[PDB]
């Protein structure tokens, strides 16, 4: 179709969101690794 | 081999702490 969507937007996360995301992923890995390895 | 995995994960978390303290993000407007 030629007509683009009027309701088309772009996701965006700043650096602070990145740091929270990376910390959450690593902290969860630290906590759960011992149990997964068992 | 597990001791290697645990140590890297602990160091990885510390690495993120160092980045967040020093490589902060300049404030935007309105915020």
């Amino acid at each position: 179709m030629a007509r683009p969507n009027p309701n088309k937007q772009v996701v965006e996360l700043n650096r602070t969101s990145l740091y929270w995301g990376l910390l959450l992923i690593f902290v969860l890995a630290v906590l759960f690794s011992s149990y997964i390895f068992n | 081999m597990e001791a290697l995995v645990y140590t890297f994960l602990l160091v990885g978390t510390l690495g993120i702490i160092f980045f967040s303290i020093f490589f902060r993000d300049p404030p935007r407007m309105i915020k």
């Binding site: 996360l13 700043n14 | 995995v5």
Partner: peptide
Amino acid sequence: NIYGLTATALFIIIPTSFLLILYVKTA
């Protein structure tokens, strides 16, 4: 520990890389 090791590895690479991609595209 083959399944235990791979699960830990994927849980790190897959989300962390995904977050990094979004940050790059934003900036």
